[PDB]
Scaffold this active site. Structure first.
Site, PDB file in Angstrom:
ATOM      1  CG  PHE B 289      -1.832  -0.966   1.219  1.00  0.00           C
ATOM      2  CD1 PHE B 289      -1.778  -2.284   1.661  1.00  0.00           C
ATOM      3  CD2 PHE B 289      -3.325  -0.727   1.142  1.00  0.00           C
ATOM      4  CE1 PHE B 289      -2.664  -3.356   1.517  1.00  0.00           C
ATOM      5  CE2 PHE B 289      -4.259  -1.527   0.933  1.00  0.00           C
ATOM      6  CZ  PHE B 289      -3.877  -2.882   1.609  1.00  0.00           C
ATOM      7  CG  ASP B 290       3.162   1.799  -3.619  1.00  0.00           C
ATOM      8  OD1 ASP B 290       4.319   1.367  -3.455  1.00  0.00           O
ATOM      9  OD2 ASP B 290       2.237   0.874  -4.036  1.00  0.00           O
ATOM     10  N   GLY B 292      -0.497   4.306   1.768  1.00  0.00           N
ATOM     11  CA  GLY B 292      -0.866   4.154   3.388  1.00  0.00           C
ATOM     12  C   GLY B 292       0.181   3.415   4.218  1.00  0.00           C
ATOM     13  CE1 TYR B 294       5.281  -0.737   1.271  1.00  0.00           C
ATOM     14  CE2 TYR B 294       7.363  -0.174   2.205  1.00  0.00           C
ATOM     15  CZ  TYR B 294       6.252  -1.225   1.795  1.00  0.00           C
ATOM     16  OH  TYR B 294       6.535  -2.610   1.653  1.00  0.00           O
ATOM     17  CG  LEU B 295       3.397   8.175   4.598  1.00  0.00           C
ATOM     18  CD1 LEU B 295       2.635   7.212   4.899  1.00  0.00           C
ATOM     19  CD2 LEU B 295       4.361   8.304   5.932  1.00  0.00           C
ATOM     20  N   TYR B 374       9.957   0.293  -7.954  1.00  0.00           N
ATOM     21  CA  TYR B 374       8.845   0.973  -8.776  1.00  0.00           C
ATOM     22  C   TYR B 374       8.927   2.385  -8.616  1.00  0.00           C
ATOM     23  CG  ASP B 375      11.067   4.527 -10.436  1.00  0.00           C
ATOM     24  OD1 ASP B 375      11.294   3.487 -10.419  1.00  0.00           O
ATOM     25  OD2 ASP B 375      11.819   5.393  -9.876  1.00  0.00           O
TER      26      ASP B 375
END
Ligand SMILES: [Cu+2]
Ligand SMILES: [Cu+2]
Lengths: 620, 620
Positions: B289-290, B292, B294-295, B374-375
């Site tokens: 959850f990028d 939520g 990781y921010l 990922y980017d």
């Protein structure tokens, strides 16, 4: 030179000479269609035979003819007389359009209808539209156009703002007779003007837009040779132009290292239909086959530098035949340029410490055409990564009617008393596939959901399945956006380094297909539009999804007749026919001139390459 | 200035001071999240209470807290201790990511697994991934990270090319213990490198690309005032930035002549989940959850002129807090520029003789973030005609695994022995609607086909139907591309000149939603992703579709809990939550670095204006 070069003025004049010499082009004859034919399968540029196909109309009423001539050899390959009531009328001639308003102006039934509405006949413009095939038996074998009236208050007035509802006339454009004038009742003619250049309507123009300058100091990155052969960032293709189809792309291939790899042999928009959804008898027969009935390429605009095409533009000015066989050039009818396309690939790696960013670009080939109130832009794009895309842009002025007092379920209100009947714009892209050559097959790929249980205890697994379409009888497919359905075209005999057949994946927009009742005249005539994808075995006489003669032609030709042959398409020379379109419920924002709306499709490589083909792109 | 201005370095330092002073920022405390609070509803009291919300973690294992401070008053408004086992763990700290590899390096089980594979422990990178909630009871209340190994042959080597399959470790990052070390068996570690900057792999770089120069000789057409207030071609908005959500758009409005008409109160990507569909126990727990967990905003890249953003760019350098309350500036983290967008409207009219063509352009606001391999690029676009659009661009390096001997139904082969597990990238756009104010409602619009018969004798008619969503219990909707389903947000108390409620229509791409089995953990935790559109009654504490503390939360939080309230949404202050994403089956073309793929949605005016809002745009 290249057998795919554009037709020259000299060739067109020579075709005229050959037809004249053969006694096929006397003074009563008119060229309804003229175009160069593609080289035969297996020619290989060995000995050139430039052939042209011509549809010849006779203004005296004699039966028309379909003729193929070899301009190289100065011969008539074939000439056949057409029974139009059976096989279809020839495309509408540009000259037949004006006939409608002219004849109606002196018709007493028309004049009485106008008088009942207090309209001056001299200010009533008439939109001469294709007739289609309905219950009028007397029309079978005749060339008919139906006319709808619009009031033009002054020379520069936009007549579309003033539709005259409750009235329609049918005209035989050859015998020059008004066959019927139907008046269902008077409707107020909308009064507000739709003059988008009137300062009273536009208000003062914005002074806030600063210039955006796009230039190429060293010129474009693509090269044009042999008049229409383009080479750009590994891509290779030939840009052709046909009066019916417009821009056609031939021999689309990608240079993968030492080899030029074919992808698509021929790509074109083979048909486009605009069916209207208002059940009023005044318009319930309305369905434009812009490509098949009108021939979109002949109405291509001359594109202006700066506003139509911005940047470093390279133009093509295709030549077509006029109604007498004389060549006519469409100055700057085709725009070619490359444009920046944002980020191509990017990664900032923590572990390696390498930050990598590359920019994308796309080659653009386009043209714009005007058919009455509508104007359409046809755009083909080639991207650095191997993606091929098509985009249609619809703009112009909405076709109007009166807005019924008490509302309508099939017409929307645009201004006081002004309505816009619901309609669709549906295209058919014909893609003669050549994935690494002509041995191709198509698989329908759906995402596959899996049930939680043994082998998938956490219920997180998901897969995909591919179904090979083996014969034409099982090659008429529908979209399924919910399961991410796509269609992959592969070459079962050409494998990548991972031993997988190379392929390309077609991504559709999954818009609604033809909405008309299946038993309607339009569902039969535009049968191709009822399904998203069709696959056929290549044949040189299967060119359009609607057949060679669409004008006033019933069902019986086109795609439904082709696929019935049930030919083998599993690892064969095949053609993909993709239906895609927009469903319109005109908004107030679409009046007085509509902003561009778009629809299209694209194909992305699918195991075609051995790794990304853009690793050699430099930092910009 | 404006209550929507970006947080200053000083305000962040002020929060640090306030917390320290209140004794809430001791040696064991770490700020897991810090962000400015949006002004409350009806805050036209000019009191200006700049409040910041902070999540405080305790590395010694003490209970975390959610604290709200007022930097204006210099006080602590609230400070609550959190019971993480009930409400979820705090976001993963960037500093805890290092912990995983370090701890594993001295663990005997881990060293034993690497020794069997002949891998030098000093060369094994460990991806510190979120844990989710599965069958491990001993994890409830603990902050766990799961680690997957990748070999890096040398400092500049891309470790992603060398996944170590059949091995996974679980780590308690607070107690600093390795709780588990699962070794399901040895899998060959893929041998080829994926170093995209290596000439051996890239080959000679292309010398064919000629420059494309995009300049604005008079500067941009947009104005930036108050640091983040944008005014461009009738549009007005405030560009905010949050460490969790990234770029957030506030008060999107359009100046329709005399008045500033609101359209959207707040637009953001409130969550983004990446579920993997490989049932192997080594990865079946993988779901990032990028936003939520990781921010995404904290990992925003510093954009480079010419590389990342081309043309005349105006930057925004947002400031965020580090783990200790110190402000950190993300230099050139936001790009703002306007770009040409082809033809806006065009019509060549035979009858009036007027040929009209106008160009389109869009205002772009974007940022790019990097999360491990990922980017992602987030782009918001505003068009001349009133259209608002969002587009996510996914790139980076594919997450790898071994490709199983015998193939796989859940992994694709990228290189010899190299696999790419299937997965999805699903986003949630939270749109706090304000169509001409806060009194809004939503209708689901479907195309309606009609049967040939009385009233539709020719079988050509087609219509549309609209269903108002009145309560939240009926506001969880799915896509239906087949019937052209869209959702219209209107203001039932604000009518255009034709007396129709003004509105905007949301056009979704209709991509597949969450594929996971409905009873899976990810379906519960990311329930928002199982449906295309949700409509809720606004509430200041319903900020994310997955809840405030996503990390290791058991499920049901966010959207499913909000709608369970079944509030009235028919002509109320509402929020639309649109789920959209990409379903991926990685191709050979996505290796060694993937080209950008995109997904998004857009909203177009639907009877919002009284006529086209672009009649005042001048000629090029
Ligand atoms: Cu239209
Ligand atoms: Cu991906």
């Amino acid at each position: 030179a290249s057998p795919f070069r554009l037709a020259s003025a000299g060739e067109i004049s020579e075709v005229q000479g050959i037809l004249r010499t053969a006694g096929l082009l006397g003074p009563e004859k008119r060229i309804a269609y003229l175009g160069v034919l593609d080289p035969a399968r297996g020619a290989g540029s060995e000995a050139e035979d430039r052939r042209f196909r011509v549809f010849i109309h006779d203004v005296s009423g004699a039966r028309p003819q379909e003729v193929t001539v070899s301009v190289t050899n100065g011969t008539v390959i074939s000439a056949v007389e057409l029974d139009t009531a059976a096989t279809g009328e020839l495309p509408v001639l540009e000259e037949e359009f004006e006939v409608v308003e002219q004849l109606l102006a002196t018709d007493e039934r028309w004049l009485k209808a106008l008088a009942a509405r207090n309209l001056d006949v001299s200010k009533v413009r008439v939109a001469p539209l294709s007739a289609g095939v309905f219950e009028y038996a007397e029309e079978r074998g005749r060339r008919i156009l139906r006319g709808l009236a619009f009031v033009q208050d002054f020379p520069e007035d936009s007549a579309w703002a003033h539709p005259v509802d409750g009235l329609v006339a049918y005209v035989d454009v050859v015998s020059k007779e008004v066959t019927r004038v139907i008046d269902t009742g008077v409707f107020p003619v909308p009064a507000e003007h739709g003059n988008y250049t009137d300062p009273e309507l536009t208000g003062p123009l914005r002074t806030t837009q600063k210039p955006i300058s796009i230039t190429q100091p060293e010129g474009p990155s693509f090269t044009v040779t042999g008049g229409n052969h383009i080479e750009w960032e590994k891509w290779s293709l030939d840009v052709g132009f046909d009066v019916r189809e417009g821009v056609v792309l031939h021999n689309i291939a990608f240079r993968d290292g030492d080899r030029l790899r074919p992808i698509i042999n021929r790509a074109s928009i083979a048909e486009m239909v605009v069916p209207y959804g208002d059940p009023s008898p005044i318009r319930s027969w309305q369905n434009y086959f812009d490509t098949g009935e009108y021939l979109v390429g002949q109405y291509a605009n001359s594109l202006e530098l700066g506003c139509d095409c911005l940047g470093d533009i390279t133009y093509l000015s295709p030549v077509i035949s006029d109604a007498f066989g004389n060549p006519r050039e469409i100055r700057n009818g085709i725009c070619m340029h490359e444009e920046d396309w944002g980020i191509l690939a990017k990664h900032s790696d923590l572990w390696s410490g390498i930050n990598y960013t590359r920019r994308n670009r796309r080659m653009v080939i386009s043209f714009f055409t005007t058919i009455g109130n509508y104007d359409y832009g046809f755009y083909w794009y080639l991207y650095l990564d191997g993606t091929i895309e098509f985009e249609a842009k619809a703009t112009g002025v909405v076709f109007t009617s009166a807005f019924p007092e008490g509302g309508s379920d099939n017409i929307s209100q645009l201004a006081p008393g002004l309505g816009a009947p619901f309609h669709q714009h549906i295209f058919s892209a014909r893609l003669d596939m050549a994935i690494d050559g002509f041995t191709n097959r198509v698989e329908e790929e759906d995402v596959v959901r899996q049930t939680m249980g043994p082998g998938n205890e956490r219920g997180n697994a998901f897969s995909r399945k591919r179904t090979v379409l083996t014969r034409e009888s099982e090659a008429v497919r529908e979209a399924d956006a919910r399961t991410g359905r796509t269609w992959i075209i592969s070459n079962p005999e050409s494998k990548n380094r991972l031993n997988e057949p190379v392929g390309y994946k077609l991504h559709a927009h999954n818009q609604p297909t033809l909405l008309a009742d299946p038993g309607s005249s339009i569902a039969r005539r535009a049968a191709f539009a009822t399904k998203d994808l069709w696959v056929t075995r290549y044949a040189d006489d299967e060119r359009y999804p609607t057949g060679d003669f669409v004008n006033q032609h019933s069902g019986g030709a086109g795609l439904p007749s082709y696929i019935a042959q049930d030919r083998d398409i599993d690892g064969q020379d095949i053609v993909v026919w993709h239906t895609f379109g927009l469903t319109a419920f005109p908004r107030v924002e679409d009046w007085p001139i509509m902003p561009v709306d778009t629809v299209g499709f694209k194909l992305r490589p699918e195991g075609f390459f051995d790794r990304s083909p853009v690793l050699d792109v430099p930092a910009n």
